[PDB]
Design an enzyme around this catalytic site. Structure first.
Site, short mmCIF file in Angstrom:
data_model
loop_
_atom_site.label_atom_id
_atom_site.label_comp_id
_atom_site.label_asym_id
_atom_site.label_seq_id
_atom_site.Cartn_x
_atom_site.Cartn_y
_atom_site.Cartn_z
CG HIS A 165 -1.24 -4.73 -6.99
ND1 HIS A 165 -1.96 -3.77 -6.28
CD2 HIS A 165 -0.77 -4.16 -8.13
CE1 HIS A 165 -1.94 -2.68 -7.02
NE2 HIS A 165 -1.23 -2.86 -8.14
N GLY A 173 -4.39 5.07 -5.59
CA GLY A 173 -5.72 4.72 -6.10
C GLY A 173 -5.84 4.74 -7.61
CB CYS A 184 -3.46 0.51 -8.99
SG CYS A 184 -1.91 0.96 -8.16
C1 LIG Z 1 2.38 10.04 -2.29
S1 LIG Z 1 2.65 9.12 -3.74
O1 LIG Z 1 3.80 8.30 -3.58
O2 LIG Z 1 2.55 9.98 -4.88
O3 LIG Z 1 1.37 8.16 -3.80
C2 LIG Z 1 1.38 7.00 -4.62
C3 LIG Z 1 1.22 5.76 -4.00
C4 LIG Z 1 1.05 4.64 -4.76
C5 LIG Z 1 1.04 4.71 -6.17
C6 LIG Z 1 0.79 3.58 -7.01
N1 LIG Z 1 0.75 2.31 -6.41
C7 LIG Z 1 1.79 1.54 -6.02
O4 LIG Z 1 2.96 1.73 -6.38
C8 LIG Z 1 1.43 0.46 -5.02
C9 LIG Z 1 2.28 -0.78 -5.18
C10 LIG Z 1 3.37 -1.02 -4.35
C11 LIG Z 1 4.23 -2.08 -4.59
C12 LIG Z 1 4.01 -2.92 -5.66
C13 LIG Z 1 2.91 -2.70 -6.47
CL1 LIG Z 1 2.64 -3.73 -7.84
C14 LIG Z 1 2.04 -1.65 -6.23
C15 LIG Z 1 0.72 3.81 -8.38
N2 LIG Z 1 0.90 4.99 -8.98
C16 LIG Z 1 1.16 6.03 -8.21
C17 LIG Z 1 1.24 5.97 -6.79
C18 LIG Z 1 1.43 7.12 -5.98
#
Ligand SMILES: CS(=O)(=O)Oc1ccc2c(NC(=O)Cc3cccc(Cl)c3)cncc2c1
Ligand SMILES: [Cl-]
Lengths: 305, 305
Positions: free
Chosen positions: A41, A143, A145
């Site tokens: 992704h 970040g 990922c």
């Molecule tokens: C403010 S928060 O919600 O804690 O910040 C995040 C944001 C993204 C985060 C993240 N990445 C995603 O989920 C992005 C995404 C979206 C839809 C599909 C896919 Cl495969 C990937 C991984 N872990 C923690 C994450 C915390």
């Protein structure tokens, strides 16, 4: 003496963490030999994430679209391919810090260490279990990922997880290092829900054996149970069924402490009925399920207290 | 999302771990520049431990009596001296993997990462706090002596602890890297007891702020208190006193969540007199005190090393 949630030393893995950039997106990659592995992704925009056609997005990319950074060095990308949900970037330099490694797919209940990274830089290490619902209860920010989960059994690193996404409940979903997701999840922003989570029964039993080895016996009782009666009771408390395989795996701990697995199962049924009554087991007021039978034997002594 | 007990990446420290042998005793040493640091009790037999005269035992030793092993390489000892309870072994080779480092003495309540080693080989990494009674609740077996505690400050490793012994209650005692013990302990096989322990109040408050950041708000109330009124409650529940310094340190977390420190204190006041009532905070049924205010900000901001 003492029992702690303990992660594997992260050194061999830190030397593999790189930063992968594709357009406006930046996440982490794992540099092993001359290949950098990262979530596929990384090629998507937020506008692509609803229903991406990865094959179509990837065919439109060239090697120079991917910027790979190892410390303060730019790695030259000489090839790119996709294996399930992981993108593999062939680079022009083999990582001199590549450890002896394996790619392993783990089952629910198994534990591993997570090296959380941001911009190809390791920031922390923690221990966690693959939940029965295939999610992991991690600690991840934007970040993270591409951060990996691993076990270091002897001098070989076995990579078992790569972080891809956070579900609406705050839990995390990812793949093995071959790009295959754990669970019924997809790398799309479509509505996805983690199934009802349960307690890893065999792991709680192993943790009760660790308490006995460390001198804690207050919860033991004079009762035993059939395996079937244990499961009828435990499943009423959202506990995973205990299989005959689990009983066999607990055999060495049973031999060491002198408490049969079905005898320890009777202590567990009592604990679920009575609670702790202001007491603690190994400094905890809850029953702990993120220590496998193998973890307990590795961490604990061969002499019971 | 997610909140885990997280240690610093152990890589820079793993590159310093060596095996130190003196006669029949084998423990771990820390190789920095051309010096190997290890507990001075490595020169003692079990009879010597009862009442040792370390200067007299040391004067009887030569450089060839100490066998230092770095991986599969024998390090040549060219000098030996003692600084408090640490033995310093001058070697012919400077450690090429020496990181930027400092020796720091920490205060009770401060946290650090422990790289547990056996035979100069790192086997696990965990996070822990220096208790108000100066003991650490570690996870240590025979051969772990010489394992170190550390923090990472930007790109500099701050060494703060070296493991020496286990007390009868299963808790651990050690020194800073200058050989000065934390607590009223001595390196001798004799009766020694850890004092009555207290809860690190500022750390519990920081952990309550972390729960708020993660969406756990059930414990919040409309109330506020004074530092005087709260410290009366703190004394009554074996909690460490909360100083004005602690209130100032919690300032950024207070600003981020919108809950004043004395407002969060009135939530803690209620949690002590009434309990959790079957509820949990961050998956825990106890109030957690091994996360400092800095740890919470670092884990909720994504700082890397
Ligand atoms: C403010 S928060 O919600 O804690 O910040 C995040 C944001 C993204 C985060 C993240 N990445 C995603 O989920 C992005 C995404 C979206 C839809 C599909 C896919 Cl495969 C990937 C991984 N872990 C923690 C994450 C915390
Ligand atoms: Cl497995």
């Amino acid at each position: 003496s003492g029992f702690r949630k303990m992660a594997f030393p992260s050194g061999k893995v830190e030397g593999c963490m790189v930063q992968v950039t594709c357009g406006t997106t930046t996440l982490n990659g794992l540099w092993l030999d001359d290949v950098v592995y990262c979530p596929r992704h990384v090629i998507c925009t937020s506008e692509d994430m609803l229903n991406p056609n990865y094959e179509d997005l990837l065919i439109r990319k060239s090697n120079h679209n991917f910027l790979v950074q190892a410390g303060n060095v730019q790695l030259r990308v000489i090839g790119h391919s996709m294996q399930n949900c992981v993108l593999k970037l062939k680079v022009d330099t083999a990582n001199p810090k590549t450890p002896k490694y394996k790619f392993v797919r783990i089952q629910p209940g198994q534990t591993f260490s997570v090296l959380a990274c941001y911009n190809g830089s390791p920031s922390g290490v923690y221990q966690c279990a693959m939940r029965p619902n295939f999610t992991i209860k991690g600690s991840f920010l934007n970040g993270s990922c591409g951060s990996v989960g691993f076990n270091i059994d002897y001098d070989c690193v076995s990579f078992c997880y790569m972080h891809h996404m956070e579900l609406p409940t705050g839990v995390h979903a990812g793949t093995d290092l071959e790009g295959n997701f754990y669970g019924p999840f997809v790398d799309r922003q479509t509505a996805q829900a983690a199934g009802t989570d349960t307690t890893i029964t065999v792991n709680v039993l192993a943790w009760l054996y660790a308490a006995v080895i460390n001198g804690d016996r207050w919860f033991l009782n004079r009762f035993t149970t059939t395996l079937n009666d244990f499961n009828l009771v435990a499943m009423k408390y959202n506990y995973e069924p205990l299989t005959q395989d689990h009983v066999d795996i607990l055999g060495p701990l049973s031999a060491q402490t002198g408490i049969a697995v079905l005898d320890m199962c009777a202590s567990l049924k009592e604990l679920l009925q009575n609670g702790m009554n202001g007491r603690t087991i190994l400094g905890s007021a809850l029953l702990e399920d993120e220590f496998t039978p193998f973890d307990v034997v590795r961490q604990c002594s061969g002499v019971t207290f």
